[PDB]
Amino acid sequence: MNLVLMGLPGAGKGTQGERIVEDYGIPHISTGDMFRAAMKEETPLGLEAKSYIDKGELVPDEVTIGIVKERLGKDDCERGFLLDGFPRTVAQAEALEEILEEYGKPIDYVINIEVDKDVLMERLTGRRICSVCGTTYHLVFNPPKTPGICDKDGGELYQRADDNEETVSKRLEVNMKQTQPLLDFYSEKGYLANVNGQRDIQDVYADVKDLLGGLK
Ligand SMILES: Nc1ncnc2c1ncn2[C@@H]1O[C@H](COP(=O)(O)OP(=O)(O)OP(=O)(O)OP(=O)(O)OP(=O)(O)OC[C@H]2O[C@@H](n3cnc4c(N)ncnc43)[C@H](O)[C@@H]2O)[C@@H](O)[C@H]1O
Ligand SMILES: [Mg+2]
Ligand SMILES: [Zn+2]
Numbered sequence: 573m574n575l576v577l578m579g580l581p582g583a584g585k586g587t588q589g590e591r592i593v594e595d596y597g598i599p600h601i602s603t604g605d606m607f608r609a610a611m612k613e614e615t616p617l618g619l620e621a622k623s624y625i626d627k628g629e630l631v632p633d634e635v636t637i638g639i640v641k642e643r644l645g646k647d648d649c650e651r652g653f654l655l656d657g658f659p660r661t662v663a664q665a666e667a668l669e670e671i672l673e674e675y676g677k678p679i680d681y682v683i684n685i686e687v688d689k690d691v692l693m694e695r696l697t698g699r700r701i702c703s704v705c706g707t708t709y710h711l712v713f714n715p716p717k718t719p720g721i722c723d724k725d726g727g728e729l730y731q732r733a734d735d736n737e738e739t740v741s742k743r744l745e746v747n748m749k750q751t752q753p754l755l756d757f758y759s760e761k762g763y764l765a766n767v768n769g770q771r772d773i774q775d776v777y778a779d780v781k782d783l784l785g786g787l788k
Contacts, residue, residue, distance in 0.1 A: 573788055574652050574680045574787075579685035580689055580747055581740065584773070585657060588773075590707060592781075593654060599649055599654065607621040607622075607625055607631060625734060633661060637668075653677070679763060682758040682764050692744060697737065700729040
């Protein structure tokens with residue numbers, strides 16, 4: 573089960589991925605999460621990536637591809653993996669092709685979670701994340717039972733630094749111009765799957781799960 577999750581900022585990659593990992597147990601590989609973890613530990617990678625992430629810009633291809641290549645080679649990817657937020661440029665897609673060719677783990681499906689750009693600002697500014705487990709909530713669409721705290725572990729929730737109007741706008745701008753070329757790239761390969769992401773979380777996952785049967 574080799575999967576790629578793609579979608580505009582806030583479309584629900586992390587939300588849907590959390591459901592996939594629970595049902596199948598494949599590693600959830602999010603480049604965004606990897607960069608932020610690096611930013612927290614203040615590693616050289618983290619500091620370099622921060623400049624781009626804080627502005628809502630894409631981190632350069634070379635360094636991004638490098639960390640994904642190493643990640644996909646780990647033992648936990650033996651039965652499959654879930655890429656989240658990578659690739660997000662045709663160049664990264666072409667690089668991944670070579671990487672998976674080397675590992676002998678070609679992509680089964682590229683799942684595009686389609687959501688109108690006009691509703692994503694609301695999805696992100698209203699997002700609140702658990703500082704302990706990283707699961708996401710939304711003040712309106714999926715609120716925690718007790719405001720400010722995680723339903724699972726009681727951890728304090730926060731708002732990601734880049735989820736402000738200005739940066740969200742840049743993120744949408746930067747990723748929107750990369751969207752059609754990526755869709756065309758995978759449509760040509762014959763394994764692009766489009767899912768309507770503008771429905772309730774479990775309804776979206778129902779369609780996502782419909783694509784996962786028979787992948788080992
Ligand atoms: N490959 C790469 N190359 C170069 N640079 C890279 C890179 N990868 C990462 N980067 C850098 O890292 C930065 C951050 O990357 P990243 O963390 O990947 O940013 P992102 O792509 O913008 O995605 P998000 O995490 O913000 O949203 P999501 O789709 O996972 O949504 P979620 O499930 O939380 O949902 C959002 C909200 O909506 C709610 N929600 C979810 N589903 C629904 C639903 N069905 N209905 C209503 N609300 C919902 C949630 O509760 C939540 O509040 C980038 O901007 C870039 O700078
Ligand atoms: Mg995410
Ligand atoms: Zn939590």
